[PDB]
Design a protein around this ligand. Structure first.
Ligand SMILES: Nc1ncnc2c1ncn2[C@@H]1O[C@H](COP(=O)(O)OP(=O)(O)OP(=O)(O)O)[C@@H](O)[C@H]1O
Ligand SMILES: [Ca+2]
Length: 358
């Protein structure tokens, strides 16, 4: 009778039970072949295996391997019979109709779920923020989106997408680190540089002032001990890596930074709701965990918004898991119980039924 919440990301799957304050399972969204290995075990044995990510930039692209992940999730991680639980899944903003249908079809036909629903990730994070109106900046491992939401529902005409998220920030850190110049090739050293990124990187409040500080002192420098025992130092790489979110030209992207996509998203919305979007800017996803990013957004958004506008950036400490938390809350609501697509409903309509109800 308990509902399941599965939040599938490009890099990590977050899964659990509705009503819980946290997912029971969080693991890499990967499948490895030399049988098959999924998640953590596939990560452990990366030397022997060739890995594949079934979700790219938030869109499920390898359905065969996506089935392995859902299977592993239900049977190994959550240890449930999917046919006994309503299941809530998540999807990226502007997820193709065909994609939501194929998801639906698989849940009912392969997993035989009694009921299901597919919710938009960013909407779910807003709900975890205690709100139904606001604009969410969701940045994970594969994609970044700005999603303005009004009274519970996303405004799709106004959603912005930026193909630049955590994996790109890891690659850039790897690049600039090698310019320094250390050596980080393997999938091993990839985890290593992802770890450095997550423990030592931060976002400068003023980029040019921070560089000058880095150039006139070794005070911003921090050491990092590698598995083998080697020790490395990074100074300005700490803030240059995430600066890329504000300045996509750092990795050769011709795109507005996250401060501007936020602005552009608000400007595609009705004038009368902008005040509320500016006062309710919620940060979501792992790539929004950089210290100083909330303050930098506040500064950048202030510079762009009308002079008198109240700007507020909400950056919940649990934001690596906001999407999941939002689904856990939504799926447990009495008011949502009629929104589930039931197997009888599917049995009559077909996968297309997902557009009507989700
Ligand atoms: N403390 C941190 N500082 C910087 N980055 C972090 C931190 N913690 C996690 N990340 C990054 O967040 C990303 C994973 O976050 P999240 O789970 O939001 O992504 P996802 O849902 O798998 O991907 P997407 O939403 O793009 O489809 C990874 O790139 C990871 O390195
Ligand atoms: Ca995500």
């Amino acid at each position: 009778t308990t509902a399941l919440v599965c939040d599938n990301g490009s890099g990590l799957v977050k899964a659990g039970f509705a009503g819980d304050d946290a997912p029971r399972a969080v693991f890499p969204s990967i499948v490895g072949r030399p049988d098959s290995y999924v998640g953590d075990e596939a990560q452990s044995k990366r030397g022997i295996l060739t890995l594949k990510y079934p979700i790219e930039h938030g869109i499920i692209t390898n359905w065969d391997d996506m089935e392995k992940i859902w299977h592993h999730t239900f049977y190994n991680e959550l240890r449930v019979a999917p046919e006994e639980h309503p299941t809530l899944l998540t999807e990226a903003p502007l997820n193709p109709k065909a994609n939501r249908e194929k998801m639906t079809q698989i849940m009912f036909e392969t997993f035989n779920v009694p009921a299901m629903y597919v919710a938009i990730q960013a909407v779910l994070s807003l709900y975890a923020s205690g709100r139904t109106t606001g604009i969410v900046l969701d940045s994970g491992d594969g994609v970044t989106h700005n999603v303005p939401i009004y009274e519970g529902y996303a405004l799709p005409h106004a959603i912005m997408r930026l193909d630049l998220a955590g994996r790109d920030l890891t690659d850039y850190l790897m690049k600039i680190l090698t310019e320094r110049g250390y050596s980080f090739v393997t999938t091993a050293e990839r985890e290593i540089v992802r770890d450095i990124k997550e423990k030592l990187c931060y976002v400068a409040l003023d980029f040019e002032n921070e560089m000058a500080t880095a150039a006139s002192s070794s005070s911003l420098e921090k050491s990092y001990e590698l598995p083998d025992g080697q020790v490395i130092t990074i100074g300005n790489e700490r803030f240059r890596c995430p600066e890329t979110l504000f300045q996509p030209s750092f990795i050769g992207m011709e795109s507005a930074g996250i401060h501007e996509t936020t602005y552009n998203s608000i400007m595609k919305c009705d004038i009368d709701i902008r005040k509320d979007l500016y006062a309710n800017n919620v940060m979501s996803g792992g790539t929004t965990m950089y210290p100083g990013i909330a303050d930098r957004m506040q500064k950048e958004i202030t510079a762009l918004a009308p002079s008198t506008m109240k700007i507020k950036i909400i950056a919940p400490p649990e934001r690596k898991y906001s999407v999941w938390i939002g689904g856990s809350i939504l799926a447990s609501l009495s008011t949502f119980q009629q929104m589930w697509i039931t197997k009888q409903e599917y049995d009559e309509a077909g996968p297309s039924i997902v557009h009507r109800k989700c």
